[PDB]
Amino acid sequence: SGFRKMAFPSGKVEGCMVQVTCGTTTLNGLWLDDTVYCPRHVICTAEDMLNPNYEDLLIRKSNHSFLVQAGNVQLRVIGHSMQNCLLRLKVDTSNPKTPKYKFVRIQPGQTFSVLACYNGSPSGVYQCAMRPNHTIKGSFLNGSCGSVGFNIDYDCVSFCYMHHMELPTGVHAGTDLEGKFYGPFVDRQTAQAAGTDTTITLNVLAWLYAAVINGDRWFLNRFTTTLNDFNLVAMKYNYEPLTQDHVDILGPLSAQTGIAVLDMCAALKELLQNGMNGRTILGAAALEDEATPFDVVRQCS
Amino acid sequence: SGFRKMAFPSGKVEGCMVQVTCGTTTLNGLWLDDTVYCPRHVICTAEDMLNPNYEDLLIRKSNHSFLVQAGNVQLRVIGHSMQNCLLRLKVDTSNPKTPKYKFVRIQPGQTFSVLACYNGSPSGVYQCAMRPNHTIKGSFLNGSCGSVGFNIDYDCVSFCYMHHMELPTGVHAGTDLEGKFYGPFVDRQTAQAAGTDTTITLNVLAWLYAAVINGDRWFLNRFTTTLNDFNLVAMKYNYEPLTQDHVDILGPLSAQTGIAVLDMCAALKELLQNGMNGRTILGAAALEDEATPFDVVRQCS
What we know:
2 copies of one chain form a homodimer. The first copy, chain A, is of the alpha+beta class. The first copy, chain A, folds into 3 domains: 1-14 and 100-197, Trypsin-like serine proteases (Thrombin, subunit H), CATH 2.40.10.10; 15-99, Thrombin, subunit H (Beta Barrel); 198-301, main proteinase (3clpro) structure, domain 3, CATH 1.10.1840. Chain A is 23% helix and 24% strand. Chain A is built from 9 helices and 13 strands. Chain A has a 7-stranded antiparallel sheet with strand order 5-4-1-2-3-7-6, with no helix packed on it. In chain A, strands 8, 9, 10, 11, 12 and 13 form a 6-stranded mixed sheet that branches. In chain A, a hairpin with a 2-residue loop joins strand 6 (81-83) and strand 7 (86-90). The longest helix of chain A has 14 residues, at 261-274. The A-B interface holds A 1-11, 14-15, 115-116, 122-128, 137-141, 144, 166, 170, 172, 214-215, 275-276, 278, 280, 283-286, 299 and B 1-11, 14-15, 115-116, 122-128, 137-141, 144, 166, 170, 172, 214-215, 275-276, 278, 280, 283-286, 299. The PDB classes it as hydrolase. Keywords: SARS coronavirus main protease mutant, Cytoplasm, Metal-binding, Ribosomal frameshifting, RNA-binding, Thiol protease, Transmembrane, Zinc, Zinc-finger.
């Protein structure tokens, strides 16, 4: 069988999605327990965004400037505060659907599912990876702000992303659930631009092991290599350096297939140096880097 | 923004997933209202599968040979019948989570989301397309049988696939929710093999329009072509013939981008004849064919 980049089932999260309107600005928020979290820029107008000041904009606001609707049944807000780039809106009702959850900050390379929402209304679910340049390559249209990203850990939903904006290149940027941005982005409309990305070596290797485990084994190779030698190649092809840690993470996968990590590197080096020859690995004409070792293992014994 | 192949939010469907055990065989079933549907081969043993007879195997069965568990809380079955390759197990309890739903038979080329499940326990969600050869290219491991496929139509869940088996090539096969297989497959373990696939022209074209709408416009072209001429190319590259109907479906997309359908065909012909030159459309090194015109439109105005 294998391998599809799947997202987690979005049910536990759909139930925590609500809408938040501040005058003329509408976007999604996350309703957990008695609190609703959302991007602080729901306070701004397209004017405000050309360099806003949120301390200013928010002191001019009361708990009744915010309309919150869990479905049709509106909630009443009874507090508010500003946690970095987020708004914590205390509210009268506790969310019944509130699942076991926590907030984690996700590292670059790691993946999560995104629940695209509009007006508090889940539209679609997909999986992506936090880019090295701290952006995600997503599909977000207007009013998608406040859509969240998450993994699931048994019964417990770990929230790790909330959507704030689109960058000029069409790639997306956001924050963890404490309102700290990923990357050097600020929630102001300036000339900020994505730093230059790099391909996630660790993930590409894990994917190659997903292929091997699935009979697409043609790219294989008798050669080996030292990580120093491979890393010179990586450099020329804008791949992240491989480290001993990356090698260790990949231990279990090389075990179950019996192909040493350094052998797959040898093989990858050739794929990079020699190209692919319109051949396909797992039905792909290019090396996939949005699947982690843990994603592959969970889906391939 | 755009474009990601997203699946629908799997919440409405997670709640209808239950486990079904028949002696030593376990797999997933669909609990809607007072009925639970599941693959009929839950009746068989790896022995039985080398050419089984289900009329036989099922008359030797009673309503208490089937253990059904909605979570922990077990259901009691109080009927049973065989609808083509499916089992309809009447049960004492009606599913509270039962959403507005219906059963549709999906056409080749069209797409849907899959909720991969094991022991009545949703594992991941993804989107795929019904292949021309009537298989889906999925990720299904043992005990995933009974996992269903569906689209959502406002509030109403249209079910269209239920998983039955893996074919020798690692591609998957199943039935609609009336138990009729897609394709010439039977639920017996024989030498049956996937017919030869073909690339879904209509979908590749819709994808190119998704690219255009997103500034990856480099593959464009001043030439045009007649569908006859294009179809000779399609033939040589194992793409489905383009028909006037396909052209019509693509009308809205060519409108909103202003590029005539036959112009994109001209452009595609070149992509096929000249290759891609390691350049990327929407960040892909090969032409994607699992996104329909309707998928693209829903995600790109």
